[PDB]
């Protein structure tokens, strides 16, 4: 489960690099301020800066990364997703329609006037719950895209990631 999250993190970073022209040492327009959880049960929170200019390309990259990570999972492990999808986004779905229901949620929510008009430089990220074992804390990593629109897609995905633990 930690390895899935870590693969995902590579799939985001690598797709942001090839599609949105991101890199580790690119100056971010939007910078992540505070990244905490309301009730943390053994999760360590870091922030990795893989920033770029094209927010449209970023968003599509975060989807394509999440889509192929999900589809890489076995059908038994893959059947866990619809449940944890509803926990975070409170929308019903099923194994086959999850890949698009997520795209619809992101492409709608992250193209909202509020999101796209946001010139607030230092932005915060607030997730409500994250579970983790005592002997093995979970490593959460918000990949900063450098834009409100891209970070929106990361936070939408982040909310699914966190529900898998709990």
């Amino acid at each position, epitope marked *: 489960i930690q390895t899935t999250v870590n693969t995902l993190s590579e799939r985001i970073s690598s797709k942001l690099e090839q599609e949105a*022209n991101a*890199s580790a*040492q*690119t*100056k971010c*327009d*939007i910078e992540i301020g505070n990244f905490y959880i309301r009730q943390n049960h053994g999760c360590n929170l870091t922030v990795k800066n893989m920033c*770029s*200019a*094209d*927010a*449209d*390309a970023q968003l599509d990259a975060v989807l394509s990364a999440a889509t192929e990570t999900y589809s890489g999972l076995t059908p038994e492990q893959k059947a866990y997703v619809p449940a944890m999808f509803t926990a975070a986004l409170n929308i019903q779905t099923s194994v086959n329609t999850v890949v698009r229901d997520f795209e619809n949620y992101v492409k709608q929510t992250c193209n909202s006037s509020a999101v*796209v008009d946001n*010139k607030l430089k230092i932005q915060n990220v607030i997730i409500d719950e994250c579970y983790g074992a005592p002997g093995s804390p979970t490593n959460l990593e918000f990949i900063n895209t450098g*834009s*409100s*629109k891209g970070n929106c897609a990361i936070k939408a995905l982040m909310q699914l990631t966190t529900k898998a633990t709990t």
Partner: antibody
Amino acid sequence: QVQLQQSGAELVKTGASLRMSCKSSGYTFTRFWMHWIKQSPGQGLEWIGYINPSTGYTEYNQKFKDKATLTADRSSTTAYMQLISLTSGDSAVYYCARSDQTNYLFPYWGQGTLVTVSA
Amino acid sequence: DVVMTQIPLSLPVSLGDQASISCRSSQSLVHSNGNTYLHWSLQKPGQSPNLLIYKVSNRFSGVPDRFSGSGSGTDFTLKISRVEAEDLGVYFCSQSTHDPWTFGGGTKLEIKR
């Protein structure tokens, strides 16, 4: 091949306003930032500010926060800079410059727009 | 806000000779990430500036190896080996470690004949 084609020279009255343009081509408009630089004879090369054509996000130099306003039209792959309250000290050559990937460099510069502030 | 200062204001140089141009800044140009963002540009008469060297040492697409940059912190120098007549212009050291970005006054390269 990258190309930044700025607008022609402009004469405008003092206290007035103007908007120069800079049309980019030969690269993905939304993929790289666009910066603006002033080259006066009195003061040297001064950095004005930058704009992200994709998100419209901008940052300005403290010295130019009231003088310059940067916009961008994705439709026509052009970026604009508006100058306000023109005075004699605004008379200079103004450059649009495209960023590198990291947004720390100016590989590509436009030919320059000459501004002349005189009644 | 960070002041770039170049010495000299201009430099007469013969063909084949080497040219040296220094640039001093008020603060260190090292950044949180560890990179030193100092660059050298050449503006010829009539033209717009072209980037020659970036981040102290690195040459730009299609810049001959006879251009090289050195230094760290605040003191930097640009060396132009084997000067050609085409090299004449005004060389600007600049920085992008601190906002606002800033340029030097420039050094004019006079070619001796």
